[PDB]
Amino acid sequence: TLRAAVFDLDGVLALPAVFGVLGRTEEALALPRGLLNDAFQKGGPEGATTRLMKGEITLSQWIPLMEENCRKCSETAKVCLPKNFSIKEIFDKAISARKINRPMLQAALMLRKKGFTTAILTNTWLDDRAERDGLAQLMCELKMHFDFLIESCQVGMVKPEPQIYKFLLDTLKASPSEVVFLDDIGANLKPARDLGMVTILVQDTDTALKELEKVTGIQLLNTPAPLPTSCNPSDMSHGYVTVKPRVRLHFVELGSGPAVCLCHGFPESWYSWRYQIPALAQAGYRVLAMDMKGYGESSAPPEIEEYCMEVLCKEMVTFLDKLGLSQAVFIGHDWGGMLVWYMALFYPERVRAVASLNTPFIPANPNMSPLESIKANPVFDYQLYFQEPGVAEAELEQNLSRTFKSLFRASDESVLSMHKVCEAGGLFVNSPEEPSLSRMVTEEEIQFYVQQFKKSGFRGPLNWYRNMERNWKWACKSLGRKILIPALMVTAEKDFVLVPQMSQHMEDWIPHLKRGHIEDCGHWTQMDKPTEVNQILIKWLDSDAR
Amino acid sequence: TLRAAVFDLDGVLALPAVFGVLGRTEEALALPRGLLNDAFQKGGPEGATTRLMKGEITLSQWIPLMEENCRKCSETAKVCLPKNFSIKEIFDKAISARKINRPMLQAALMLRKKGFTTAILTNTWLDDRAERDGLAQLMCELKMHFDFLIESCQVGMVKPEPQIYKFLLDTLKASPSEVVFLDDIGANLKPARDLGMVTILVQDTDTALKELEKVTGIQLLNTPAPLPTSCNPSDMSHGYVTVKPRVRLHFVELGSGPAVCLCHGFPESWYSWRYQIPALAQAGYRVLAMDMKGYGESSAPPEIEEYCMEVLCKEMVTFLDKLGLSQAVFIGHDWGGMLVWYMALFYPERVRAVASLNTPFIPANPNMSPLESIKANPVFDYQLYFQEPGVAEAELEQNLSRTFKSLFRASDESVLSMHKVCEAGGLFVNSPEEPSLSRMVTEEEIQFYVQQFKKSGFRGPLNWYRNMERNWKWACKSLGRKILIPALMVTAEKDFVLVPQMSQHMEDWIPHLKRGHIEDCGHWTQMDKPTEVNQILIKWLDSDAR
């Protein structure tokens, strides 16, 4: 029975193959057929290319050797290489054109999810070209999805040499019959077949995957669209910043580029952005996913006033100051969305751009108490239930698994009644003790939240709703302002509290506002519709946030 | 007696003053004198500019109001504003031209170092211009050096209103006679004088500082050149990455821009780069100052093999992978310098550029044991003393304060004998029990190292020297290579072990090598000559690392 799958890089996980460019150049330059491929492999195991692949020399040292073999091959064939003939330009173009073969990576992803040990085995080089970063980026993206990456230049062995295959088996800790090996070079497949491995000669991806699914007995072709890459908490870089003597803020950090600070809502975590973090970092951004004050590994002081918008905003500014960041793009959801609008209003110099999921920007009404305003709409009753210190804490901390299983459900999986929460005596009065696991979350994801909330519970998080008068007084100071920095409002069709129509007047205050809208999306936006959130945010960042 | 100093921003801590540009524009455009200054202050406390300064409106909302006042003022004066008249272009230019008034900041730095509470009090605006980042950067740089920053647009009060001064005194927690207040606007100084504060009208910086030193009795003018800004460990962002099940790496992180990974030597810390971190972040880089494996908050496994170059290098690559960084520039000192050369040799695709302080690149000799090679040079005897497990640990951990006070000394303060360490029975056999504090370090800086080394001691750090055979075998694999990526070698005139002449053959292996050289500099480069290290590294990063 198969339990390991090995994939080649060039022509398998990455296309067009760097090899096939030798043939295209020959055709474009009307050079003899195979001339460039012949000079490339000149000398066989004793040649320049084999030394390169074994790590003996770098790609920049190899370039002039390849030039010399091209001269030699042209001399024998009685032909002339054109004037501006440059191996460097040829390879720079070839490497740059090579992209991840998405359906092949997806097949590798499915096998690993099904218990297979996955590996990349490749004949590669030590790239010291001025433009080496392109390749480093590709290898970085691919490698994360596999258990092992074996590079010829790092192990000092090359395919089709028999030793690299015995090295492969030792690393996999598997016998040959337990391994599927995919390669686009028949010669490099031969030693694996001879050892007893299942071998697939990759020409076109589709046929290779048909062979792959037939041999593993796992559906790899025609499968439903996959969810974006998530986060394993133990594999992330965790950051800690003391913003004031008793207050430390924790964050998860991934990527390089403009700083994007993600601000979760109630009662969530940095982990609510798990599907966005890898995607935004891959799109060219340095993602800082916060544990907001009161949550996870961030400090959770008991005092109500520690959670008013003015203090929360000041601490996020100090957070930027200590990290040495003059600005970040601020993206928030729910309570996080409310904070990001106020960051844009009070600290525009520190906000590169602002985006909110579900949370509209509604200006304070100076002629009405915020208590009055909340009472007017019956969908906001849960917020009145949250007012009395200790009440909501007791019900929410009673059974954490039940709390998170009951909350984190799709728009059609509701087990909760939002009207008359106070009157009924709680959110879970007529809700199950052991709710079914929502289609949106796994047991493992729920247990992560349970573990996070064991530290500080619900006091700090609930205190975010306990500053209505303080927040209204502060917001009133901003009534003569407009938000004029880049801004994005994302509405969720099925959020029954933060309804899309509540955002209808935002253009009066944010004239240049851009929008996104997600159909069949409930309140828990990021995990409800991650692909669509990713598409909207990446499109908007690339156009408005640089 | 004075105990607090307050400085204005425009015309005091920052020059040329944004205000004086109104006069320059009038002169360049041959407009009536004071026309632009008159339209700027139009309406006084009821005017557009006062609303802006109080935070009622943003700078982008203010721009068209100022345009309207300029039209009104030109109409009354019977003059015409030219065609391409734009207040935005005028202010964009003015804000951009404004730079930190270095001698004023230095005077503020000296007073704070001498016990004064320092503050910035400014009439400023909420900047939402597309180019607001320039100003955010300036405010960020300045604010870090003061106890308080009071902005008119944030407090809803403006100078010369009496309330902002009572607000200032409350924040300082000082009576008026204890305060020196510096301002370039006589009108804004008046309420502070009336309250009983010492007031300085700032016209030219030099005279203002003369008045400042006369009143405080502290030398502020003609003072010796200051050391660069250092780091307070409790104010930094601390990062943690698990590179393998038993190995976590800690780092300090500051700035935005290309990633610069700083790698200390033996027996040091992330804190060895304290004078470089703020400087490199200010120069436009995202600094990652490591605690190398075996040190500080990083894991320190006991096994010798855990510290060979191959494993150390692989873990730094994984560190990049987990942070989502395809590359970083690698800067190392001593053992860190040795690691960075090997990163450039084995992982060039992951190394944007490489720089070493003191540590030359010397290729392995395949015809000689590294044990043999070390014995040949008497200055390397300390490395033979480090070979036997437990010996050096016992002497170095015996008294931590003594260890660090004895080590961290300038080239002329040596209390250590480097010849015949083994024969004499240790590094400190004929060295003081209570050494004098070197001119390079404070007691506080020494106690930081003492505290760091209390966690894991010297085993892990010493293990870095216990892999000579393993390292030599690995280095031999690289003998046919050259380092062809951007590289910088920094020599220290007075390093008696890592002598500048040991670097003389490096061009044979790194043909495009750039150099720096520091006169009168011992082994502890970063703290011996921080200004010169900063100058060399920033010049080289800006030319070769982007």
Ligand SMILES: Cc1c(C#N)n[nH]c1-c1cc(F)c2c(c1)C(C)(C)C(=O)N2
């Ligand atoms: C129940 C609850 C708690 C708790 N404890 N925190 N936040 C919310 C909540 C907030 C919302 F905005 C929306 C919803 C729930 C539903 C009803 C799913 C919706 O459609 N919107």
Ligand SMILES: Cc1c(C#N)n[nH]c1-c1cc(F)c2c(c1)C(C)(C)C(=O)N2
């Ligand atoms: C003594 C010691 C220890 C310890 N325990 N670690 N490292 C060093 C050391 C290394 C060097 F390279 C140089 C020096 C000291 C001096 C003599 C200051 C120099 O000039 N170079």
